[PDB]
Amino acid sequence: EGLEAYDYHLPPEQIAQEGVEPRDMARLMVVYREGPFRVAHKRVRDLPEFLRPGDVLVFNESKVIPARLLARKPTGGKVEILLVRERALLGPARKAPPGTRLLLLSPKDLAPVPGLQAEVVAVEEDLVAHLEEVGEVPAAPTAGLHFTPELLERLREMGVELRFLTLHVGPGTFRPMHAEPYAIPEEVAEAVNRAKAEGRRVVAVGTTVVRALESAYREGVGVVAGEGETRLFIRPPYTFKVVDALFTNFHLPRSTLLMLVAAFLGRERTLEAYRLAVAEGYRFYSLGDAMLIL
Hints:
Blueprint: E1 27-31, E2 39-43, H1 47-50, E3 56-64, E4 67-72, E5 78-83, E6 100-104, E7 112-119, E8 129-131, H2 149-157, E9 161-169, E10 180-184, H3 186-197, E11 202-205, H4 207-215, E12 217-218, E13 222-223, E14 226-230, E15 245-249, H5 256-265, H6 267-279, E16 290-293
Parallel strand pairs: 1-16, 3-9, 3-11, 11-15
Antiparallel strand pairs: 1-2, 4-5, 6-7, 7-8, 9-10, 10-14, 12-13, 15-16
Protein backbone atom coordinates (compact mmCIF):
# COMPACT_ATOMS: atom_id res chain seq x y z
CA GLU A 1 0.00 0.00 0.00
CA GLY A 2 1.47 3.32 1.10
CA LEU A 3 1.93 5.59 -1.91
CA GLU A 4 0.28 2.88 -4.00
CA ALA A 5 -3.03 3.76 -2.33
CA TYR A 6 -3.05 7.01 -4.32
CA ASP A 7 -1.92 5.57 -7.64
CA TYR A 8 -3.79 5.39 -10.94
CA HIS A 9 -2.86 5.10 -14.61
CA LEU A 10 -2.39 8.46 -16.29
CA PRO A 11 -1.68 8.25 -20.03
CA PRO A 12 1.20 10.71 -20.56
CA GLU A 13 -0.77 12.06 -23.54
CA GLN A 14 -3.54 13.38 -21.29
CA ILE A 15 -1.20 15.72 -19.44
CA ALA A 16 -2.06 19.06 -21.05
CA GLN A 17 0.85 20.65 -22.92
CA GLU A 18 -1.18 23.79 -23.57
CA GLY A 19 -4.28 25.46 -22.16
CA VAL A 20 -7.65 25.83 -23.87
CA GLU A 21 -9.00 29.17 -25.12
CA PRO A 22 -11.14 30.67 -23.84
CA ARG A 23 -9.81 29.38 -20.52
CA ASP A 24 -13.29 28.68 -19.13
CA MET A 25 -13.99 26.21 -21.94
CA ALA A 26 -11.78 23.70 -20.13
CA ARG A 27 -13.84 20.72 -18.98
CA LEU A 28 -15.22 20.59 -15.44
CA MET A 29 -16.02 17.36 -13.62
CA VAL A 30 -18.49 17.95 -10.80
CA VAL A 31 -18.42 15.23 -8.13
CA TYR A 32 -20.22 15.01 -4.78
CA ARG A 33 -18.68 14.19 -1.37
CA GLU A 34 -21.95 12.83 0.00
CA GLY A 35 -24.67 10.59 -1.38
CA PRO A 36 -24.21 8.08 -4.25
CA PHE A 37 -21.30 8.28 -6.67
CA ARG A 38 -22.40 10.81 -9.29
CA VAL A 39 -20.71 13.32 -11.53
CA ALA A 40 -21.67 15.95 -14.08
CA HIS A 41 -19.47 16.39 -17.14
CA LYS A 42 -19.41 20.14 -17.71
CA ARG A 43 -17.10 23.01 -18.55
CA VAL A 44 -15.64 25.60 -16.19
CA ARG A 45 -18.00 28.18 -17.68
CA ASP A 46 -20.85 26.14 -16.17
CA LEU A 47 -19.69 26.79 -12.61
CA PRO A 48 -22.54 29.30 -11.95
CA GLU A 49 -25.00 26.41 -12.30
CA PHE A 50 -23.50 24.71 -9.27
CA LEU A 51 -23.09 27.73 -7.05
CA ARG A 52 -25.72 29.96 -5.49
CA PRO A 53 -26.12 33.51 -4.19
CA GLY A 54 -24.30 33.77 -0.90
CA ASP A 55 -21.59 31.26 -1.78
CA VAL A 56 -18.18 32.66 -0.92
CA LEU A 57 -15.59 31.92 -3.59
CA VAL A 58 -12.05 32.34 -2.25
CA PHE A 59 -9.07 32.64 -4.62
CA ASN A 60 -5.38 33.21 -4.13
CA GLU A 61 -3.50 36.04 -5.82
CA SER A 62 0.28 35.77 -5.68
CA LYS A 63 2.13 38.77 -4.28
CA VAL A 64 5.84 39.09 -4.95
CA ILE A 65 8.11 39.86 -2.02
CA PRO A 66 11.36 41.45 -3.33
CA ALA A 67 14.79 40.83 -1.79
CA ARG A 68 16.85 43.53 -0.07
CA LEU A 69 20.38 43.05 -1.38
CA LEU A 70 23.54 45.07 -0.76
CA ALA A 71 26.29 45.09 -3.38
CA ARG A 72 29.46 47.01 -4.23
CA LYS A 73 31.10 47.59 -7.60
CA PRO A 74 34.72 46.31 -7.73
CA THR A 75 35.74 49.98 -7.93
CA GLY A 76 34.13 50.80 -4.58
CA GLY A 77 30.65 52.17 -5.23
CA LYS A 78 27.68 50.95 -3.18
CA VAL A 79 24.46 49.85 -4.88
CA GLU A 80 21.15 48.48 -3.60
CA ILE A 81 19.59 45.50 -5.34
CA LEU A 82 15.88 44.79 -4.96
CA LEU A 83 15.66 41.32 -6.46
CA VAL A 84 12.04 41.02 -7.59
CA ARG A 85 11.55 37.95 -9.80
CA GLU A 86 12.70 35.79 -12.73
CA ARG A 87 15.12 33.21 -11.34
CA ALA A 88 17.25 36.38 -9.92
CA LEU A 89 17.21 38.55 -13.05
CA LEU A 90 14.76 41.41 -12.54
CA GLY A 91 15.53 44.21 -10.07
CA PRO A 92 16.17 47.93 -9.60
CA ALA A 93 17.91 50.29 -7.14
CA ARG A 94 20.44 53.15 -7.05
CA LYS A 95 22.16 54.65 -10.11
CA ALA A 96 25.42 53.44 -11.70
CA PRO A 97 25.14 52.52 -15.39
CA PRO A 98 25.26 48.94 -16.67
CA GLY A 99 28.29 47.51 -14.85
CA THR A 100 29.36 44.72 -12.49
CA ARG A 101 28.74 44.33 -8.76
CA LEU A 102 29.82 42.11 -5.87
CA LEU A 103 27.18 40.71 -3.51
CA LEU A 104 27.91 41.76 0.07
CA LEU A 105 27.05 39.57 3.05
CA SER A 106 24.19 41.15 5.00
CA PRO A 107 25.17 40.39 8.59
CA LYS A 108 28.18 38.05 8.33
CA ASP A 109 30.73 40.85 7.94
CA LEU A 110 29.37 42.98 5.09
CA ALA A 111 32.15 41.31 3.11
CA PRO A 112 32.00 40.26 -0.54
CA VAL A 113 30.21 36.92 -0.77
CA PRO A 114 32.62 34.52 -2.47
CA GLY A 115 31.79 34.02 -6.16
CA LEU A 116 28.55 36.01 -5.75
CA GLN A 117 28.58 38.54 -8.59
CA ALA A 118 26.25 40.24 -11.07
CA GLU A 119 26.27 42.66 -14.00
CA VAL A 120 23.60 45.04 -15.30
CA VAL A 121 22.39 43.72 -18.66
CA ALA A 122 19.34 45.20 -20.41
CA VAL A 123 16.53 47.38 -19.04
CA GLU A 124 12.86 46.70 -18.24
CA GLU A 125 12.97 43.27 -19.89
CA ASP A 126 12.19 39.77 -18.61
CA LEU A 127 17.56 44.26 -15.37
CA VAL A 128 20.63 42.32 -14.24
CA ALA A 129 22.57 39.06 -14.58
CA HIS A 130 24.14 37.43 -11.51
CA LEU A 131 26.61 34.57 -11.13
CA GLU A 132 27.48 31.94 -8.50
CA GLU A 133 25.01 30.52 -5.97
CA VAL A 134 22.62 33.07 -4.46
CA GLY A 135 22.46 33.63 -0.69
CA GLU A 136 19.54 32.27 1.32
CA VAL A 137 19.28 34.75 4.20
CA PRO A 138 18.58 38.31 3.06
CA ALA A 139 4.80 32.43 -12.75
CA ALA A 140 3.01 29.06 -12.66
CA PRO A 141 -0.44 27.86 -13.87
CA THR A 142 -2.99 27.01 -11.17
CA ALA A 143 -6.73 26.30 -10.75
CA GLY A 144 -7.47 30.02 -10.84
CA LEU A 145 -6.17 30.20 -14.42
CA HIS A 146 -9.46 28.63 -15.61
CA PHE A 147 -11.43 31.77 -14.77
CA THR A 148 -12.02 34.60 -17.24
CA PRO A 149 -13.24 38.15 -16.61
CA GLU A 150 -16.57 37.00 -18.10
CA LEU A 151 -16.96 34.05 -15.73
CA LEU A 152 -16.05 36.25 -12.78
CA GLU A 153 -18.65 38.84 -13.80
CA ARG A 154 -21.36 36.21 -14.27
CA LEU A 155 -20.57 35.01 -10.74
CA ARG A 156 -20.87 38.56 -9.36
CA GLU A 157 -24.17 38.95 -11.18
CA MET A 158 -25.58 35.93 -9.37
CA GLY A 159 -24.46 37.13 -5.95
CA VAL A 160 -21.40 34.92 -5.51
CA GLU A 161 -18.79 36.56 -3.32
CA LEU A 162 -15.34 36.79 -4.85
CA ARG A 163 -12.70 36.96 -2.11
CA PHE A 164 -8.91 36.94 -2.50
CA LEU A 165 -6.22 35.94 0.00
CA THR A 166 -2.50 36.41 -0.67
CA LEU A 167 0.20 33.83 -1.33
CA HIS A 168 3.65 35.33 -0.75
CA VAL A 169 6.19 34.46 -3.45
CA GLY A 170 9.51 35.80 -4.68
CA PRO A 171 13.12 36.15 -3.37
CA GLY A 172 11.92 37.79 -0.17
CA THR A 173 10.43 34.48 0.98
CA PHE A 174 13.39 32.14 0.36
CA ARG A 175 14.72 30.28 3.39
CA PRO A 176 16.61 27.14 2.24
CA MET A 177 6.59 19.86 3.27
CA HIS A 178 7.16 23.02 1.23
CA ALA A 179 6.21 25.81 3.65
CA GLU A 180 3.56 28.20 2.32
CA PRO A 181 3.69 31.85 3.47
CA TYR A 182 0.38 33.68 3.03
CA ALA A 183 -1.67 36.66 4.13
CA ILE A 184 -5.41 36.81 4.68
CA PRO A 185 -6.97 40.30 4.35
CA GLU A 186 -9.21 41.40 7.21
CA GLU A 187 -12.24 41.67 4.92
CA VAL A 188 -11.65 38.11 3.71
CA ALA A 189 -11.29 36.60 7.18
CA GLU A 190 -14.40 38.52 8.20
CA ALA A 191 -16.36 37.37 5.13
CA VAL A 192 -15.44 33.71 5.64
CA ASN A 193 -16.38 33.69 9.32
CA ARG A 194 -19.67 35.51 8.76
CA ALA A 195 -20.53 33.07 5.95
CA LYS A 196 -19.86 30.09 8.24
CA ALA A 197 -21.92 31.67 11.01
CA GLU A 198 -24.76 32.11 8.52
CA GLY A 199 -24.46 28.61 7.08
CA ARG A 200 -23.25 29.86 3.68
CA ARG A 201 -20.70 27.87 1.65
CA VAL A 202 -17.02 28.75 1.50
CA VAL A 203 -15.76 27.52 -1.88
CA ALA A 204 -12.01 27.20 -2.30
CA VAL A 205 -10.45 27.84 -5.68
CA GLY A 206 -7.28 25.79 -5.56
CA THR A 207 -5.45 23.84 -2.86
CA THR A 208 -3.30 26.85 -1.98
CA VAL A 209 -6.47 28.54 -0.77
CA VAL A 210 -7.45 25.35 1.05
CA ARG A 211 -4.11 25.15 2.88
CA ALA A 212 -4.14 28.83 3.82
CA LEU A 213 -7.74 28.88 5.12
CA GLU A 214 -7.42 25.63 7.10
CA SER A 215 -4.06 26.73 8.56
CA ALA A 216 -5.53 30.10 9.60
CA TYR A 217 -8.45 28.53 11.46
CA ARG A 218 -8.46 28.89 15.26
CA GLU A 219 -10.95 27.02 17.43
CA GLY A 220 -13.50 29.33 19.03
CA VAL A 221 -12.51 32.09 16.63
CA GLY A 222 -12.65 30.94 13.02
CA VAL A 223 -10.20 32.10 10.34
CA VAL A 224 -7.84 34.83 11.57
CA ALA A 225 -6.79 37.83 9.49
CA GLY A 226 -3.16 38.49 8.75
CA GLU A 227 0.06 36.76 7.83
CA GLY A 228 0.64 33.09 8.38
CA GLU A 229 2.55 30.10 7.11
CA THR A 230 1.70 26.43 6.68
CA ARG A 231 3.67 23.27 6.00
CA LEU A 232 0.80 21.06 7.10
CA PHE A 233 0.35 17.93 5.02
CA ILE A 234 -3.39 17.55 4.52
CA ARG A 235 -4.22 13.91 3.83
CA PRO A 236 -6.72 11.27 5.00
CA PRO A 237 -7.94 11.45 7.63
CA TYR A 238 -8.60 15.18 7.94
CA THR A 239 -11.63 17.21 8.98
CA PHE A 240 -11.98 20.49 7.11
CA LYS A 241 -12.98 23.38 9.36
CA VAL A 242 -13.43 26.05 6.67
CA VAL A 243 -13.63 24.67 3.13
CA ASP A 244 -17.11 23.46 2.11
CA ALA A 245 -16.39 22.86 -1.58
CA LEU A 246 -13.28 22.67 -3.74
CA PHE A 247 -12.51 23.76 -7.30
CA THR A 248 -9.14 22.27 -8.23
CA ASN A 249 -7.13 20.76 -11.08
CA PHE A 250 -6.62 17.06 -11.78
CA HIS A 251 -3.44 16.13 -9.93
CA LEU A 252 -0.71 13.60 -10.75
CA PRO A 253 -0.67 10.03 -9.38
CA ARG A 254 0.89 9.67 -5.92
CA SER A 255 1.06 13.46 -5.56
CA THR A 256 0.55 15.19 -2.21
CA LEU A 257 -2.05 17.35 -3.98
CA LEU A 258 -4.06 14.24 -4.88
CA MET A 259 -3.74 13.23 -1.23
CA LEU A 260 -5.29 16.51 -0.13
CA VAL A 261 -8.22 16.01 -2.51
CA ALA A 262 -8.54 12.46 -1.17
CA ALA A 263 -8.88 13.90 2.34
CA PHE A 264 -11.69 16.16 1.15
CA LEU A 265 -13.58 13.78 -1.15
CA GLY A 266 -12.55 10.40 0.28
CA ARG A 267 -9.69 8.25 -1.04
CA GLU A 268 -11.72 5.54 -2.78
CA ARG A 269 -14.23 7.98 -4.31
CA THR A 270 -11.35 10.20 -5.41
CA LEU A 271 -9.54 7.37 -7.21
CA GLU A 272 -12.84 6.32 -8.82
CA ALA A 273 -13.46 9.86 -10.12
CA TYR A 274 -9.89 10.08 -11.39
CA ARG A 275 -10.19 6.78 -13.26
CA LEU A 276 -13.42 8.11 -14.78
CA ALA A 277 -11.66 11.35 -15.73
CA VAL A 278 -8.96 9.34 -17.47
CA ALA A 279 -11.50 7.14 -19.28
CA GLU A 280 -13.54 10.21 -20.30
CA GLY A 281 -10.59 11.94 -21.95
CA TYR A 282 -10.07 14.77 -19.43
CA ARG A 283 -6.76 16.63 -19.61
CA PHE A 284 -4.56 16.64 -16.50
CA TYR A 285 -2.14 18.89 -14.61
CA SER A 286 -1.59 22.67 -14.65
CA LEU A 287 -2.95 23.42 -18.11
CA GLY A 288 -5.59 20.70 -17.95
CA ASP A 289 -9.21 20.56 -16.86
CA ALA A 290 -10.81 21.08 -13.47
CA MET A 291 -12.79 19.30 -10.80
CA LEU A 292 -15.46 20.76 -8.51
CA ILE A 293 -16.18 18.80 -5.34
CA LEU A 294 -19.49 19.65 -3.67
